[PDB]
Design a protein around this motif. Structure first.
Motif, PDB file in Angstrom:
ATOM      1  N   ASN A 104       0.772  -1.162   0.065  1.00 30.62           N
ATOM      2  CA  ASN A 104      -0.012  -0.096  -0.003  1.00 30.62           C
ATOM      3  C   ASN A 104       0.764   1.162   0.000  1.00 30.62           C
ATOM      4  O   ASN A 104       1.687   1.539   1.098  1.00 30.62           O
ATOM      5  N   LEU A 105       0.960   2.087  -1.016  1.00 32.15           N
ATOM      6  CA  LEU A 105       1.720   3.192  -1.018  1.00 32.15           C
ATOM      7  C   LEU A 105       1.404   4.368  -0.181  1.00 32.15           C
ATOM      8  O   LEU A 105       2.057   5.061   0.141  1.00 32.15           O
ATOM      9  N   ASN A 106       0.220   4.149   0.432  1.00 30.11           N
ATOM     10  CA  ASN A 106      -0.386   5.225   1.304  1.00 30.11           C
ATOM     11  C   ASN A 106      -0.332   4.894   2.906  1.00 30.11           C
ATOM     12  O   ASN A 106      -0.753   5.517   3.694  1.00 30.11           O
ATOM     13  N   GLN A 107       0.244   3.633   2.967  1.00 33.46           N
ATOM     14  CA  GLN A 107       0.031   2.994   4.483  1.00 33.46           C
ATOM     15  C   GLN A 107       1.384   2.292   4.819  1.00 33.46           C
ATOM     16  O   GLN A 107       1.931   1.639   4.010  1.00 33.46           O
ATOM     17  N   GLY A 154       4.600  -2.559   7.203  1.00 29.72           N
ATOM     18  CA  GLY A 154       5.633  -3.335   8.010  1.00 29.72           C
ATOM     19  C   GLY A 154       6.684  -3.999   7.344  1.00 29.72           C
ATOM     20  O   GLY A 154       7.347  -5.090   7.911  1.00 29.72           O
ATOM     21  N   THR A 155       6.537  -4.243   5.957  1.00 24.52           N
ATOM     22  CA  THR A 155       7.669  -5.052   5.145  1.00 24.52           C
ATOM     23  C   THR A 155       8.258  -4.339   4.219  1.00 24.52           C
ATOM     24  O   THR A 155       9.421  -4.973   3.428  1.00 24.52           O
ATOM     25  N   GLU A 156       8.337  -3.053   4.054  1.00 26.56           N
ATOM     26  CA  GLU A 156       8.922  -2.182   2.923  1.00 26.56           C
ATOM     27  C   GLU A 156      10.378  -2.302   3.266  1.00 26.56           C
ATOM     28  O   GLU A 156      10.918  -2.078   4.446  1.00 26.56           O
ATOM     29  N   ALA A 200      -3.330   3.529  -7.910  1.00 25.16           N
ATOM     30  CA  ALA A 200      -3.995   2.871  -6.955  1.00 25.16           C
ATOM     31  C   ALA A 200      -3.243   3.000  -5.646  1.00 25.16           C
ATOM     32  O   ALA A 200      -2.085   3.339  -5.662  1.00 25.16           O
ATOM     33  N   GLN A 201      -4.016   2.741  -4.239  1.00 25.70           N
ATOM     34  CA  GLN A 201      -3.181   2.797  -3.304  1.00 25.70           C
ATOM     35  C   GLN A 201      -2.524   1.356  -3.018  1.00 25.70           C
ATOM     36  O   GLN A 201      -1.378   1.133  -2.568  1.00 25.70           O
ATOM     37  N   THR A 202      -3.552   0.270  -3.285  1.00 29.22           N
ATOM     38  CA  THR A 202      -2.971  -1.083  -3.124  1.00 29.22           C
ATOM     39  C   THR A 202      -2.704  -1.606  -4.235  1.00 29.22           C
ATOM     40  O   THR A 202      -3.171  -1.413  -5.300  1.00 29.22           O
ATOM     41  N   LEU A 203      -1.640  -2.536  -4.548  1.00 30.79           N
ATOM     42  CA  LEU A 203      -1.147  -3.244  -5.537  1.00 30.79           C
ATOM     43  C   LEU A 203      -2.525  -3.868  -6.348  1.00 30.79           C
ATOM     44  O   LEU A 203      -2.982  -4.515  -5.760  1.00 30.79           O
TER      45      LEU A 203
END
Ligand SMILES: [Ca+2]
Length: 240
Positions: A61-64, A67-69, A142-145
């Motif tokens: 999610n580009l906007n949230q 915990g994995t990035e 999109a926000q989510t992939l």
């Protein structure tokens, strides 16, 4: 991706977000595929601008905060030497980015599987495009992939007059064209994942859609054909 569905978090772990610095923050501009711990495959046209780029792996999610990035700068950009920004239809829309640090692999971060050199898919082969690109022509990212099922359209059909004509080359893969589902701006550079002998492999690097719109009937999304560039890719990685 127009007409997509939200990808599961761990479905496409080689997908990356290529972002550029925009004021005090970062903006997603393109997708890419992680192909070594320190190399990303993307579209040449994604890196025509003289911007500061970073790669984000393990993004969803580009906007949230997921915990994995992992965030890593781009150290070197190698564009195919035949690339011409004036002529996307000529092909050669591929570039490799050497990352400033090697990323750590896990369920969310994996190397993309590439096809063997020369591999061509049968017409109507099952593939998914993935990305955070516009969800409608002239829409917003999109926000989510997102993923969309885009079966291939072989060269003979894709380069026929009612499809893309001479604009499509044999160094490209066409997929979709149903008028509902497609890549769209911001998906550029990302993968087309196609299922072959039980394994998804990245057969395409997203290159272009119609100037008329993203989801246009008989204008399938067009991708650089990864299997045309295996030697080029190996040569770059070996010399850098
Ligand atoms: Ca995130």
């Amino acid at each position: 991706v127009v007409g997509g569905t939200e990808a599961q978090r761990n479905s496409w772990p080689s997908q990356i977000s290529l972002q550029y610095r925009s004021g005090s923050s970062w903006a997603h501009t393109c997708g890419g595929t992680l192909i070594r711990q320190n190399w990303v495959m993307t579209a040449a046209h994604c890196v025509d601008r003289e911007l500061t780029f970073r790669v984000v792996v393990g993004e969803h999610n580009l906007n949230q905060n997921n915990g994995t990035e992992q965030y890593v700068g781009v150290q070197k950009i190698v564009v195919h030497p035949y690339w011409n920004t004036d002529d996307v239809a000529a092909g050669y829309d591929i570039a490799l980015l050497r990352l400033a640090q090697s990323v750590t692999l896990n369920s969310y971060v994996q190397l993309g599987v590439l096809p063997r050199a020369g591999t061509i898919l049968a017409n109507n082969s099952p593939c998914y495009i993935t990305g955070w690109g516009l969800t409608r022509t002239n829409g917003q990212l999109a926000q989510t992939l997102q993923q969309a099922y885009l079966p291939t359209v072989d060269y003979a059909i894709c380069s026929s007059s009612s499809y893309w004509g001479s604009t499509v080359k044999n160094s490209m893969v066409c997929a979709g064209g149903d008028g509902v589902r497609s890549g769209c701006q911001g998906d550029s550079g990302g993968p087309l994942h196609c299922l072959v002998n039980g394994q998804y492999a990245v057969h395409g690097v997203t290159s272009f859609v119609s100037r008329l719109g993203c989801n246009v009937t008989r204008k399938p999304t067009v991708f650089t054909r990864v299997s045309a560039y295996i030697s080029w890719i190996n040569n770059v990685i070996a010399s850098n």
